[PDB]
Amino acid sequence: HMSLTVKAYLLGKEEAAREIRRFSFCFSPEPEAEAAAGPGPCERLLSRVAVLFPALRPGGFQAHYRAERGDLVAFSSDEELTMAMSYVKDDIFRIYIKEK
């Protein structure tokens, strides 16, 4: 039932913030149980970022998240999401959006 706002940062050519948008997410593991054919959180988030950041391709982009070291790690799997949230202690998940 809990909620979690995910902040996305658009990066152009000079890695400069192009557009900023956020969306309310559910603390749940996945939206569906039958429809879900493997993924869940990743496919869900990547879905919003697309409709939220129409400036680039719909599915032609990779979301990079900062790690314990700070470096960027292009994630694209639910297993990677569950870990990304492990870093942030608050209810805000920040990520770096980049169009392929």
CATH number at residue 96: 3.10.20.90
Please tell me the experimental approach by which this structure was elucidated: NMR
Tokens of 62: 């990779």
Length of the chain: 100
The Cβ of residue 9 has, within 10 Å, a number of other Cβ atoms equal to 19
Where are the alpha helices (H) located in the chain, listed in sequence order? 41-52, 78-87
**Reduced to 3 states, what is the DSSP secondary structure of residue 41?**
helix
Tokens of 19: 């557009």
57 vs 54: CA distance, rounded Å: 7
97 vs 100: CA distance, rounded Å: 10
Count how many domains the chain has: 1
Residues with Cβ within 8 Å of 98's Cβ and at least 6 positions away in sequence, in order, are 11, 61, 62, 63, 64, 74
14 vs 8: CA distance, rounded Å: 17
Domain of residue 100: give its range: 1-100
CA atoms within 13 A on the CB side of 15: 3
